[PDB]
Structures are given as structure tokens and as C-alpha cells.
């Protein structure tokens, strides 16, 4: 698998044209675009440890059906949990390990890995604020579209709409909600090369708008904009991957309010931890299957 | 102390905060936070909970019956639209910068709006100018009529003022904002504004441009707003959300100041012309209506003591060739439709895997065919993943099957045209979703009424109207195609096509059929006779019809509350397809005060038993 | 929404924690509360121009 | 009647009319606390 004699070079081309990979032999493809700093060490400590009261997508708002995603989403859970309590109890960080162990995850090491270095390199102001949702970004991104053509600004906020309200669906709320399996079909491959960007994933997403601006400007009340969001079209992707790369291009890093770091997380002696989590308001979910259980032993008992 | 709440009554964006009333006294309004506005109305006494689609400021109440109240929108047009019977009769566009004094002496009608550079005088019988006050670097603040017949009194935006009879010295504050109120009589003037001054002039010009300054007592600092209220009080909203009720031959004398607690305080008031009554609104956007004489009293009393293409040519195209055929249903459609070719949008709906709700479809609907079950069903899940609420209402395919029949020749244009069919057309029907669009379809049944008020008369005396909705809505779920004729009903809906500006003819077209047969109809009891009747075989001129029906729609005065009014919501957006409120949540009142009722006995009995189990803890 | 009222609450315990009886409606003890809250501060600055 | 001080001192709070029965409490204190301040001002 480690003989890298392709080019990175010639896959940045590549994923304009022959978009990203067969899902069954991706494995080798995404890594390469990505980075991900794998020795013999760290997770077999974090498997060895591990675990378990915060999570809430085993049984409380997500099932897993299928023990290849149940009995081993809970490995990358564990690790990503046990790791960072980041992950453990947030929400639009939880978002990113579903899907990879949907997406991945058999494919252990990898779901795993590919959480992290996107933690830390396009997650990285997507906690900042906790409980909720990270605000800087979603200032960012208003700041994107505002310079990208700032007519949808001004009606919108004419209208009294807010971030969050018109940029979490791809954002604050995690990158995928928006989108379904098929066409999101790995965007975080189809932006793996441009991660190197303030993410271009924040072209990305104010391209989720500014593109509608079309329906986005007939937005009088919210309750219209909810619609946007709750449905969660998949809208083109590819001409939203291509038109916020242009605006990466075209927005210099002088128009952009949050700065990202350069954030290549490789360290063949170490993980590196996600430091933008609020220690202070974490690690308090429950499951606690006994309350529910004890009904079911007092029925038994009045039986 | 009434109160009036719309979340509940339209639930909705709201928080409202400014309330406006009327000179007939049956007619409300407020401007709402969006920038839209709610009006109301008393006659029939209903809810009414019906909205404006504006970006206002200002809502100007018209005295027509209809209102279609001058609404100065955030583009300074001035909308003269209403609720009552919908329509945005009229556009007037024509000011710019943010119109900021709206109003009209309804005592021959007059309207005065005014801009910054210029106040305008509009009548309003057309809409037109009279007068136009433009003045060189005057920025005007404000002004507004004297009703007294007749002054315009203005403003500058340094402070000075002017008067302008009607027929061709100052304040010197330089206020930011201001508000100048003309009291009912004419004689006096009061401005309020940044400073906390009660200035009054006269009108009755006795001090000529010149305004006194009596400071607002207590702690006023300032107003929010201010108007003359029954007979000579002022009311001003003080900015410490407290109202005011002053007195003019006592200059202060404050009568009156109710907030309810006072921890939730006024944004903003208006009373109604019948002085009995003032209604504020909280700043949480509540309105309180409270008898204002009794709040006088109240207060006062006690408080004493305390110290090819183009329409014509494809009108008349359709009508004398008679329809067209089908290899251009895409020029002709997609001209008359304002379609976008919003082949993206469309892509986007067609490949997402698996669709649950129509999998199935000969289930209900047996047609035979595993190929055009197949493109129905590759546009019914189009439209599902466009708005599930559309399989809720799992009857679509009803409607879609016609079209997957006819257009089905181009599958993005099918689906097109139907949110047309959808988003125009079928205004109303997805209001009562999962069930028959029926309160809602009331502007079907009023429209029976309209075209033949015999027919409707003795259509609900003899059909009860539960199902007579539902006799309808089939045929408008599908619409007259499995009606009427199979392939020669086309005509009606080229027609609807070529006449795709006026979207109320998809009623005015299934009422047109009711209106054909007339007595043939007034028999019938049940609408398991009359929708079978209308499927027979019957010798329809269909084109005759169709174009009878066009010159009715155009024959009564846009006054009616035909529940849902539809707009031109032809053209869709291009990129992605537009957003579309096809949602219910709306009250039918009787149902629900039935079921309060019960469950507070089922309640009431259910603790009882409860208490006499009493004698179960005694066992543990 | 209910945050008032845990501060009317808070506002009579600590009011009469220096013996300021409230025998009064809660609409007003904002005022009350208005009133202690720059009393303590007036007294605060008060005394510190004595120290000067 | 305690109105008019507070409303010089700025209280812009709601009145009651059991306000007495406090405000003459709590109204004195805002004019004095330590009312030698108005002389500790010129000292």
C-alpha cells in the first residue's frame, strides 16, 4: 500500500475531471490526498480504552442496524470520544465519525484518522462555542458572500434573517446534513486538496448560498427558510465544488475574518488534539438502559 | 384588556409592533417584524388572520370597503393591497427614499407621502399626482394633512417649518427623528422626537410655524410615537414604553398611563377611530386592547386620591386552430408558463435512489402500464423530494398521471410546469394536508356561488358540503381529464396555458363545467351521483365554455375573500426551483373547543378515581 | 422568559438580607432592585472618598 | 410623592402604591448612604 509513486499533482487535476475514486479502492487514493500520520501505537491505546455514556446515536436519536457500522462505529466513537471529549459529546463533531464509519469504517483505522485530520484541518473553528454551534465560521462565511455579490445580504438581512438561519445547513450544523450519501459522495475527497485553503470548504459553503441566491432572495419569513434546511437537497454539489473553488481564487485571504492555520497534523509520535473545545462546559447522552430496564423488572416483580 | 396574539391566529413570523386602525372602525392592521402586514377585519367577524407580502413601514388605511391599504414598502412603493380579497390592485411605484408620513384626509381623500425631498400628494381614486412639493435641500422630516380641509404642514430636516395650504418659522430642533401628529379638529400640531419636548403649535396658526416647548413630564426622555386621541388628548408613547395620555387645555394633566405590568412595555399604539377603543402592542409584539375611556376613568378616578410565441398571438392561435400539437408543448408551455429550463434543479430530484412513498402505485391506481406507471413515478418522487408534504396527500398521482400522459414527452418540463400547476395554480391546495384541501377549497364553492348562486345555493342544501369539498377536489386532484374528457379537455387546459396570467381560472374552469349544466345539477343529493355525472359522456363544447368562463373572470370587482387568493407565482427560479408554503396549521375553531371541553371531563373524572386510590397505597 | 422572576426572587432575598422589608407587589421590585443596586455602589464610592 | 425623587435620581422604575412602605427605606439611602459625600466631594 506505501509506495507512493503518484502524485498528489496529478490528483488535484484529477478531481476536477474524474471527480474521486471507486468506492471500493479509495482507500488508497483519499489518504494520499489527505495525510494521515499512521504508526503502530495511539489507537490501539485508544481502543483499549473506552467509550460510552454519551452516545446518543446508538440508540436515542441514530440506530445502527448493521453490526459492520454498530459493533464498530462504537471502536471510532470510543477513540474519537476518548481522544477528545470534543467528540464525544458534540454534535456537528459526532456528524463527522457517522458518516465515516458509514462511509469508511471497515476501514477502522481510517474513519478514524480521516476524523482527525479533518479536526484539525477543517474542524477547527467548528466548535468555539459549546454547546452550541461555532459563530465564528458563520461570520466568515457572510463575510464570503457578501463580498460575493452582497445584493443577498442586503435583502436578506432587510428581512431580519441571521447567520445560522441561512448558513448552518453545510456548516454549523456539520458539512453533510445538507447533503445525502450519493451527493456528497465524498466531497470531503472531492476538497481533500483544498484543505490548504481558509477551508475552500467556507467557499463551499457560502457557494451553498449565493448560488440560490435565486430562491434565497424570495425569503420573507422564516418559517420559508426553515424549507431550505429540513428538506436538505443536494442541490449540484458539483457546481458549488467548482464555483467556491473559483472564489478561492478569487477572494483573497484579505476578505476572510477567521484565520485558518496551516494545520498538517503529522506526527509519527503523536495525535494531535483538537484545542478548541471549552473544557469548561464538557464531559458531563447517559444511555443509562436501566431506566427504562427497571419497568420492565417491576412489571416482572408485580407479575 | 383583550388580547390579540398571531402566533396562534396565523402562526408565522411575526413579534408584531406596529398597529395601525382604520376610519370605518372595521378595519386593523399591523406591520409585523418581515416587514409585512397583517390585516384584519370585523363585518363577518372572522380571523381573518390573512397577510400582506410587503417590505413596509407604513400602513396607510384606504377607506374602500377592501381597503387595499397604501402600504409604502422598503423599495418606497407604495403597495395598495389587502387581505380582504387579497390583490395588490395596484403598484404605485413612484417615490424613492424611504417614504416616512403616509396618510390620507379622508374627508374628500387626499394622500400625502412624503419623502425626504419630496411631499407628494397623491388621489386616490387613481392613484395619481396632483401636487408635488418638491423642494431643493429641504430633506424633510416630516409633515403631514390637517384634516380640516386642507394643510400640508412640513418639516425640514434642520428644525424649521413650513406650512402649505393645500391651494398653492420653526421648532429649531434639529431632531433626527420626529413625528408630527395633527389633531382631528385641525388646530393643533404636536411634534415629538429625539428631544423630550410636547411641541405644540396650533393650526389656528397663532404662533405661524413657531412650536412651544413644553418638556414631557416625569420620565418621558423622549417618544417613540405620538398621536391625537377622541377629542384633544395627546398620546404618546414615551421611549420608558409608557404611555401618556396628556391633555390639551391643561397642557399636561396626564390622565392616563396604563401599561398592564409594566414590565412588558410598549413599542408602539394606535387607537381605533372609535376612541373607545386603544389598542398597544408590546414590545414581545402582544396587543392589548383596552377600553381607553374605562382606562381613563379607571386611572384617573383612583389615582386621585394617591399621594409562435407571444400570448395574443397563442390565445387566439389555441382557440380558432383549436389546441396545438405536441412536439411544441415545450415553446408553447414553456412561453406561456415563464419556464426557467431549470434542468439542474430538475437533475438534482431524479437520481437520489430509493422513493418509499410511491413504490406501490397501482395499488390505488391500476392502470396497467409498467412503463407509465414508471415516468409517474419518476415525477411523483421528483415532486415528493421537492415538498414531501405533496405525498401526504398521497392522491397526486391524480393529477401527475394527465401530465405524465401528455407532457410526459419531456419529464424536467413536466415537473415544471406542475409546481406551475402547483405553485400558481393550486394555490390552496395543500392546506389541509394530509386530507381534502377544503377552507381552502371554500374559494372553489365561492366561486360556484360567483359563477351561479342557484347552483351553489342548492348544491350545498342538498350536498353537505363534506362531500360536496370532496366531489370537487376529485375533480380538481386530477383536474378534468378523467372528467369531462379523456383527450378533449385539452382544450381547457391550453387555455389555462394561454392564460396563464390569470391563475384563478383553474377554479373559474372547473366552476365553468358546474356553470354549464345548471339545472341538471340541482337534483342531485349526494356527490357519489354528481362527480360520476360529471364523467358522462356529456356533449360539452368545451372551447365554448372555456372562453365564456374567461369573460366572467373578469366581471366582478377583485373584492371578494375568496380564501386563498392566488397571485402570480407563475415563473419559477432558475438554478435550484423556489420555496413554496404548501403547509396546513390553520383553526377551524368548533372541533377543538369540543375536544378542550371533553378532555377537561375525561380529566376531571380521571383524578377522582385516582384520589379513591387511596386505598392501593394502603397495600404497599 | 422566567429569568425575572428567579431575579424578583433573588431580589427580595437579598434586599431583606439587609433588612430592606418588602411589604409590597413584585411590579416595582426592579425599582427596589434599581435602587440597591446603586445604593451599594453609592455607598461604596462614597466611603472611598473618605479614605482619600 | 417618592416618585419625584426617583425619578430625579433616575430610578425610571414602575411605582406601586405599598411603595412606601419600602421605597421610604431604600429612596433615603440613594440620597445619602454616606450623605457626608456631598461634602467629602468638596473636602
Known amino acids: ?303 | 384588556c383583550d388580547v390579540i396574539n398571531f402566533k396562534t391566529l396565523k402562526k408565522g413570523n411575526w413579534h408584531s409592533f406596529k398597529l395601525q386602525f382604520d376610519s370605518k372602525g372595521a378595519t386593523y392592521g399591523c406591520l409585523d417584524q418581515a416587514g409585512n402586514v397583517t390585516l384584519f377585519y370585523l363585518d363577518k367577524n372572522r380571523y381573518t388572520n390573512v397577510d400582506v407580502q410587503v417590505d413596509s413601514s407604513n400602513l396607510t388605511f384606504i377607506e374602500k370597503p377592501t381597503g387595499y391599504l397604501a402600504v409604502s414598502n422598503a423599495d418606497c412603493s407604495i403597495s395598495i393591497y389587502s387581505i380582504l380579497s387579497g390583490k395588490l390592485i395596484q403598484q404605485l411605484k413612484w417615490h424613492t427614499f424611504k417614504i416616512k408620513k403616509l396618510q390620507v384626509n379622508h374627508m374628500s381623500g387626499y394622500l400625502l407621502s412624503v419623502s425626504s425631498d419630496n411631499c407628494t400628494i397623491w388621489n386616490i381614486n387613481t392613484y395619481e399626482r396632483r401636487k408635488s412639493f418638491f423642494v431643493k435641500n429641504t430633506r424633510y422630516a416630516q409633515g403631514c394633512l390637517t384634516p380640516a380641509g386642507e394643510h400640508l404642514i412640513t418639516l425640514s430636516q434642520n428644525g424649521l417649518v413650513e406650512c402649505h395650504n393645500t391651494d398653492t418659522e420653526e421648532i429649531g430642533l434639529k431632531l433626527k427623528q420626529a413625528h408630527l401628529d395633527i389633531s382631528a379638529e385641525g388646530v393643533y400640531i404636536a411634534i415629538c422626537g429625539d428631544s423630550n419636548y410636547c411641541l405644540i403649535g396650533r393650526l389656528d396658526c397663532q404662533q405661524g410655524f413657531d412650536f412651544e416647548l413644553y418638556e414631557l413630564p416625569n420620565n418621558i426622555q423622549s417618544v417613540k410615537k405620538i398621536k391625537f386621541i377622541r377629542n384633544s388628548l395627546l398620546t404618546l408613547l414615551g421611549s420608558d414604553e409608557k404611555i401618556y395620555v396628556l391633555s390639551a387645555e391643561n397642557n399636561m394633566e396626564i390622565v392616563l398611563c396604563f401599561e398592564l405590568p409594566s414590565r412588558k412595555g410598549i413599542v408602539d399604539y394606535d387607537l381605533n377611530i372609535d376612541a373607545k377603543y386603544l389598542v398597544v402592542i408590546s414590545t414581545l409584539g402582544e396587543k392589548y386592547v383596552y377600553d381607553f375611556h374605562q382606562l381613563i376613568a379607571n386611572q384617573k378616578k383612583h389615582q386621585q386620591d394617591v399621594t409562435f410565441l407571444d400570448r395574443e398571438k397563442l390565445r387566439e392561435f389555441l382557440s380558432r386552430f383549436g389546441y396545438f400539437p405536441e412536439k411544441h408543448r415545450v415553446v408553447v408551455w414553456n412561453y406561456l408558463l415563464k419556464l426557467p429550463s431549470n434542468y439542474e434543479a430538475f437533475d438534482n430530484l431524479a437520481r437520489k435512489g430509493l422513493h418509499p412513498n410511491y413504490l406501490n402505485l397501482k395499488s390505488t391506481f391500476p392502470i396497467q402500464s409498467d412503463k407509465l406507471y414508471y415516468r409517474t413515478q419518476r415525477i411523483l418522487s421528483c415532486l415528493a423530494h421537492y415538498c414531501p408534504v405533496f405525498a401526504q396527500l398521497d392522491y397526486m398521482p391524480a393529477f401527475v398521471f394527465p401530465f405524465v400522459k401528455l407532457l410526459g414527452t419531456n419529464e424536467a418540463f413536466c415537473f415544471e410546469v406542475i409546481l406551475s400547476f402547483l405553485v400558481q395554480w393550486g394555490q390552496f391546495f395543500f392546506e389541509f394536508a394530509p386530507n381534502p384541501p377544503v377552507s381552502y377549497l371554500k374559494a372553489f364553492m365561492e366561486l360556484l356561488e360567483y359563477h351561479e348562486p342557484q347552483l351553489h345555493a342548492q348544491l350545498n342544501q342538498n350536498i353537505p358540503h363534506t362531500q360536496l369539498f370532496n366531489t370537487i377536489w376529485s375533480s380538481l386532484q386530477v383536474v378534468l381529464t378523467d372528467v369531462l374528457k379523456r383527450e378533449d379537455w385539452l382544450c381547457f387546459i391550453d387555455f389555462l396555458v394561454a392564460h396563464s396570467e390569470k391563475p384563478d381560472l383553474l377554479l373559474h374552469i372547473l366552476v365553468a363545467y358546474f356553470t354549464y349544466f345548471k339545472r341538471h345539477i340541482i337534483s342531485f343529493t349526494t356527490g357519489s351521483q354528481l362527480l360520476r355525472f360529471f364523467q358522462q359522456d356529456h356533449q360539452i363544447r368545451i372551447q365554448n365554455l372555456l372562453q365564456d368562463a374567461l369573460e366572467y373572470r373578469n366581471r366582478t370587482p377583485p373584492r371578494i375573500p375568496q380564501a386563498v387568493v392566488l397571485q402570480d407565482n407563475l415563473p419559477l427560479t432558475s438554478e435550484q426551483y423556489p420555496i413554496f408554503n404548501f403547509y396546513p396549521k390553520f383553526s377551524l375553531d368548533q372541533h377543538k373547543e369540543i375536544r378542550e371541553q371533553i378532555i377537561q371531563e375525561e380529566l376531571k373524572a380521571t383524578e377522582k378515581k385516582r384520589t379513591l386510590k387511596e386505598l392501593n397505597t394502603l397495600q404497599q | 422568559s422566567l429569568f425575572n422572576e428567579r431575579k424578583y426572587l433573588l431580589l427580595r432575598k437579598k434586599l431583606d438580607e439587609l433588612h430592606y422589608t418588602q411589604p409590597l407587589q413584585i411590579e416595582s421590585a426592579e425599582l427596589v432592585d434599581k435602587l440597591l443596586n446603586d445604593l451599594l455602589k453609592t455607598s461604596e464610592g462614597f466611603q472611598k472618598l473618605k479614605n482619600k
Not at chain 1, 489518504?31 to 446515536?57: H, I, M, R, W
Not at chain 1, 490548504?196 to 440560490?212: G, K, Q, R, V
Request: charged residues 20%.
Open chain 1, 1 to 303: 500500500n506505501s509506495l507512493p509513486n503518484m502524485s498528489v499533482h496529478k490528483l488535484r487535476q484529477f478531481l476536477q475531471k474524474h471527480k474521486v475514486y471507486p468506492d471500493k479502492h479509495r482507500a488508497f487514493i483519499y489518504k494520499q490526498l489527505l495525510e494521515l500520520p499512521l504508526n503502530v501505537d495511539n489507537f490501539a491505546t485508544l481502543v483499549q480504552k473506552g467509550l460510552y455514556p454519551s452516545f446518543k446515536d446508538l440508540y436515542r436519536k441514530y440506530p445502527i442496524s448493521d453490526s459492520k457500522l454498530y459493533q464498530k462505529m462504537q471502536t471510532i466513537l470510543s477513540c474519537l470520544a476518548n481522544f477528545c471529549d470534543l467528540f464525544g459529546e458534540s454534535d456537528q463533531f459526532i456528524q463527522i465519525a457517522f458518516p465515516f464509519v458509514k462511509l469508511f469504517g471497515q476501514e477502522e483505522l481510517l474513519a478514524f484518522e480521516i476524523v482527525l485530520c479533518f479536526a484539525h484541518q477543517i474542524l477547527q473553528n467548528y466548535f468555539v462555542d459549546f454547546p452550541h454551534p461555532p459563530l465564528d465560521l458563520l461570520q466568515n462565511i457572510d463575510e464570503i458572500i457578501k463580498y460575493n455579490d452582497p445584493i443577498l445580504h442586503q435583502h436578506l438581512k432587510q428581512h431580519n434573517f441571521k447567520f445560522v438561519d441561512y448558513i448552518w445547513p453545510f456548516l454549523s450544523g456539520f458539512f453533510t446534513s445538507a447533503l445525502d450519501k450519493e451527493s456528497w459522495l465524498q466531497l470531503i475527497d472531492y476538497l481533500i486538496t483544498y484543505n490548504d485553503t481558509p477551508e475552500l470548504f467556507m467557499f463551499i459553503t457560502a457557494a451553498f448560498i449565493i448560488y440560490f441566491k435565486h430562491p434565497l432572495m424570495k425569503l420573507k419569513s422564516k418559517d420559508e427558510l426553515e424549507i431550505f434546511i429540513s428538506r436538505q437537497n443536494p442541490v449540484s454539489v458539483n457546481h458549488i465544488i467548482e464555483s467556491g473553488f473559483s472564489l478561492l481564487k478569487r477572494t483573497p485571504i484579505d476578505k476572510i475574518f477567521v484565520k485558518f492555520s496551516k494545520i498538517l497534523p503529522l506526527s509519527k509520535t503523536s495525535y494531535n488534539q483538537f484545542t478548541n473545545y471549552n473544557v469548561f462546559n464538557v464531559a458531563h447522552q447517559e444511555t443509562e438502559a436501566e431506566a427504562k430496564l427497571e419497568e420492565s423488572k417491576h412489571k416482572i416483580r408485580q407479575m
